[PDB]
Enzyme design. Structure first.
Site, PDB file in Angstrom:
ATOM      1  N   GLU A   8     -15.397  39.389 -41.356  1.00 22.75           N
ATOM      2  CA  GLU A   8     -16.010  39.278 -42.671  1.00 22.75           C
ATOM      3  C   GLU A   8     -16.685  40.575 -43.089  1.00 22.75           C
ATOM      4  O   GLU A   8     -17.679  40.967 -42.496  1.00 22.75           O
ATOM      5  CB  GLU A   8     -17.068  38.177 -42.688  1.00 22.75           C
ATOM      6  CG  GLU A   8     -16.558  36.751 -42.473  1.00 22.75           C
ATOM      7  CD  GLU A   8     -17.709  35.754 -42.494  1.00 22.75           C
ATOM      8  OE1 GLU A   8     -18.192  35.391 -41.400  1.00 22.75           O
ATOM      9  OE2 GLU A   8     -18.158  35.370 -43.600  1.00 22.75           O
ATOM     10  N   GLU A  42     -22.601  33.232 -43.223  1.00 21.32           N
ATOM     11  CA  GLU A  42     -23.635  32.466 -43.922  1.00 21.32           C
ATOM     12  C   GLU A  42     -24.577  31.779 -42.932  1.00 21.32           C
ATOM     13  O   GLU A  42     -25.778  31.638 -43.188  1.00 21.32           O
ATOM     14  CB  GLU A  42     -22.998  31.457 -44.867  1.00 21.32           C
ATOM     15  CG  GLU A  42     -22.402  32.182 -46.101  1.00 21.32           C
ATOM     16  CD  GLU A  42     -21.230  31.472 -46.739  1.00 21.32           C
ATOM     17  OE1 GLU A  42     -20.949  30.299 -46.398  1.00 21.32           O
ATOM     18  OE2 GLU A  42     -20.586  32.103 -47.603  1.00 21.32           O
ATOM     19  N   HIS A  65     -19.888  31.859 -38.792  1.00 25.79           N
ATOM     20  CA  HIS A  65     -19.718  32.318 -40.163  1.00 25.79           C
ATOM     21  C   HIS A  65     -20.941  33.100 -40.636  1.00 25.79           C
ATOM     22  O   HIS A  65     -22.082  32.752 -40.308  1.00 25.79           O
ATOM     23  CB  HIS A  65     -19.446  31.149 -41.105  1.00 25.79           C
ATOM     24  CG  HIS A  65     -18.930  31.591 -42.438  1.00 25.79           C
ATOM     25  ND1 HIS A  65     -19.762  31.984 -43.465  1.00 25.79           N
ATOM     26  CD2 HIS A  65     -17.667  31.762 -42.886  1.00 25.79           C
ATOM     27  CE1 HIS A  65     -19.028  32.365 -44.496  1.00 25.79           C
ATOM     28  NE2 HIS A  65     -17.754  32.239 -44.171  1.00 25.79           N
ATOM     29  N   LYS A 125     -16.444  25.709 -47.706  1.00 22.14           N
ATOM     30  CA  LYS A 125     -17.902  25.811 -47.673  1.00 22.14           C
ATOM     31  C   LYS A 125     -18.572  24.523 -48.152  1.00 22.14           C
ATOM     32  O   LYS A 125     -18.043  23.425 -47.954  1.00 22.14           O
ATOM     33  CB  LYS A 125     -18.368  27.019 -48.497  1.00 22.14           C
ATOM     34  CG  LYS A 125     -17.719  28.313 -48.005  1.00 22.14           C
ATOM     35  CD  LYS A 125     -18.254  29.542 -48.720  1.00 22.14           C
ATOM     36  CE  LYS A 125     -17.522  30.786 -48.246  1.00 22.14           C
ATOM     37  NZ  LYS A 125     -18.109  32.034 -48.825  1.00 22.14           N
ATOM     38  N   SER A 179     -12.910  38.637 -49.555  1.00 23.21           N
ATOM     39  CA  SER A 179     -12.354  37.969 -50.727  1.00 23.21           C
ATOM     40  C   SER A 179     -10.830  38.060 -50.727  1.00 23.21           C
ATOM     41  O   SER A 179     -10.263  39.158 -50.741  1.00 23.21           O
ATOM     42  CB  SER A 179     -12.918  38.583 -52.011  1.00 23.21           C
ATOM     43  OG  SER A 179     -12.218  38.097 -53.150  1.00 23.21           O
ATOM     44  N   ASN A 233     -11.714  27.931 -46.050  1.00 26.23           N
ATOM     45  CA  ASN A 233     -13.088  27.478 -45.863  1.00 26.23           C
ATOM     46  C   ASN A 233     -13.683  26.991 -47.193  1.00 26.23           C
ATOM     47  O   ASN A 233     -14.010  27.785 -48.066  1.00 26.23           O
ATOM     48  CB  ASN A 233     -13.925  28.610 -45.269  1.00 26.23           C
ATOM     49  CG  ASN A 233     -15.392  28.236 -45.097  1.00 26.23           C
ATOM     50  OD1 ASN A 233     -15.763  27.065 -45.170  1.00 26.23           O
ATOM     51  ND2 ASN A 233     -16.234  29.245 -44.859  1.00 26.23           N
ATOM     52  N   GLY A 287     -22.003  40.517 -52.737  1.00 26.02           N
ATOM     53  CA  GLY A 287     -23.186  40.686 -53.564  1.00 26.02           C
ATOM     54  C   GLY A 287     -23.634  42.125 -53.768  1.00 26.02           C
ATOM     55  O   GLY A 287     -24.725  42.378 -54.277  1.00 26.02           O
TER      56      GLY A 287
END
Lengths: 249, 254
Positions: free
Chosen positions: A165, A97, A95, A11, A211, A9, A171
Site C-alpha cells: 500500500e 487503516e 491493512h 472496507k 488506487s 476490499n 490524502g
C-alpha cells in the site's frame, strides 16, 4: 509462474440492497478462467454469510480482519478458527487503516498472520510506508521492518499474498505511478529472496494496493513484479470486472 | 415517584465464541425455552458479527440481537470495522459498547467509547454502555472516580438516555480470583444511580436500567435480581448455555 491475484476490499461499506447489487454484477461478470486469475472479495463481517452463499464459485471471500489468537473472552472480535469454521478461506491482515487508526503494530500483525495461517486461513498481508517515511528516504527500511515482523513468525509462505500500500499517496498531493509501484515491488521481492528464500521470492504474489481503476489497471498489471491488486473503492463498482480482466496483460 | 418502573433487562454476551452447529443449537434452546412475557423482561443476545445474520433469522420474536461493538463514526475507509448505520440496515437493534475487554485489550479510551455511544444512538441503535473498575483501581479507593469518568465521557455527548442501558462490570472480580457479593453489586449500582441523579437528572437516574455484568449463574441470579438498584444482567459464559433461560426467569423476582 505466479497466478495473477485480484482482491476487492469493500472496507466499511455495504447495505443489504447494495450488497445484493454488487453480487449480481460479480456473478454476471465476464472474466478470465480460474487458472488465469484468482479472485477474492472482502465484505464486512456481517455480510460474509450472504455473500459467501450467493457468490459464484470461482470467486472466494475474505474477512477484513481477525483476532490475534484463540477465541474466548474477546468481546467484539472474530477469531481465525471462527472464520475457518464458517468456510471463509481468506483474511486481510495489517491493512494500513488498521495500522494507523486502530494502532496495530508490526509485531501484532505478524502474530495475526502466523495465527491465521495455523488455523487454515489464507492471508493477504499488507505493508506500506507513509509520506513522511518516504520523504525521509525510509521506504524500504519501513517496508522491510513490516515484512520482517511477519517473516519472523511464519515458515510457510504458500498461502500468503503480500499487498503493498503506497500510504504516501493517500490524502496527499502525490500520485503513485506504475513505475513507482514496480520499483517497490521489485525491492520487496528482492528482500524476500534474501531474507526468506529465493523460492519464496519467486512464488509469492506481491499485489499492488494503491488506487486501482479501469483506467490504470492494465499498465499496472504489465509491471513485471506486480502480481495483481488489492482494490479499494472500485471493488464496490462494476469496474471491478474490468480490473479482473487486466490479468490477461 | 412519578416514573414507571424499570423493565428487567437480560443481555447475553457470547463474546468471541461460536460455531455454525453450536449457534444453531443455542438458538433452538432459546426458542424452546420457557420465560416470562416481554412486558416483564427484555432479552437481548449478542453473537459475534459473523453470526448476526443467522441468529437474527432464527431467533424467537420476543428476543432481539445486539452487536458486540461498532465503529466510532460514519462508515467508509475503515477496514475491519462495522458501522452503526450498517447494523441498523441489517436490522440489528442493539449494540454493546465499552466492554471491559475492549477498553483493556483493544485500548478503547473513555472518550472513544463516549463518541461511539453518541454516534450509535444518532443512527437509531439502542446501546448497552459498559463501565467498571479494575482491582487496582478498587483498592486505590477509586471505584467511583473511575466509573464517574467513564460515565461522564458518555453523558457529555448525549441528551436522551432513553435507549441506553448501563452495564456495571466489576472488573476487579473478573479473572482476579476475587468474587463480588450481591451486596457489593448493589452498593456500586446505587452509587452509580446517585451519580446520574446529580450529573444527568433525577429522571434519568430513575428511568435508566443499570445491569450487572459480573459473574451471573442460575445459582446467584435471583439474589442479584432482588437488589433494588440491579435492573438485570449482562451475562457472559452462561449465555451460551441452557442456564441462560434460568437467568432470564430471575426477572420474576421483581
Amino acid at each position: 509462474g505466479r497466478k495473477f491475484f485480484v482482491g476487492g476490499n469493500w472496507k466499511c461499506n455495504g447495505t443489504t440492497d447494495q450488497v445484493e447489487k454488487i453480487v449480481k454484477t460479480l456473478n454476471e461478470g465476464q472474466v478470465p478462467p480460474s487458472d488465469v486469475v484468482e479472485v477474492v472479495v472482502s465484505p464486512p463481517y456481517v455480510f460474509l454469510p450472504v455473500v459467501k452463499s450467493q457468490l459464484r464459485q470461482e470467486f472466494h471471500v475474505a474477512a477484513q480482519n481477525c483476532w490475534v489468537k484463540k477465541g474466548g473472552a474477546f468481546t467484539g472480535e472474530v477469531s481465525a478458527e471462527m472464520l475457518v469454521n464458517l468456510g471463509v478461506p481468506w483474511v486481510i491482515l495489517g491493512h494500513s487503516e488498521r495500522r494507523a487508526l486502530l494502532g496495530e503494530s508490526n509485531e501484532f500483525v505478524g502474530d495475526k498472520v502466523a495465527y491465521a495461517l495455523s488455523q487454515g486461513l489464507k492471508v493477504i498481508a499488507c505493508v506500506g510506508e507513509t509520506l513522511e517515511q518516504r520523504e525521509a528516504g525510509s521506504t524500504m527500511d519501513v517496508v522491510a521492518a513490516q515484512t520482517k515482523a511477519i517473516a519472523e513468525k511464519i515458515k510457510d509462505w504458500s498461502n500468503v499474498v503480500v499487498a503493498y500500500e503506497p500510504v504516501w499517496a493517500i490524502g496527499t498531493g502525490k500520485v503513485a505511478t506504475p513505475a513507482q509501484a514496480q520499483e517497490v515491488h521489485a525491492s520487496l521481492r528482492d528482500w524476500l529472496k534474501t531474507n526468506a528464500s529465493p523460492e519464496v521470492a519467486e512464488s509469492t504474489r506481491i499485489i499492488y494496493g494503491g488506487s486501482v481503476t479501469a483506467a490504470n489497471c492494465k499498465e499496472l498489471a504489465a509491471q513485471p513484479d506486480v502480481d495483481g491488486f488489492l482494490v479499494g473503492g472500485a471493488s464496490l463498482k462494476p469496474e471491478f470486472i474490468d480490473i479482473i480482466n487486466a490479468a490477461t496483460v
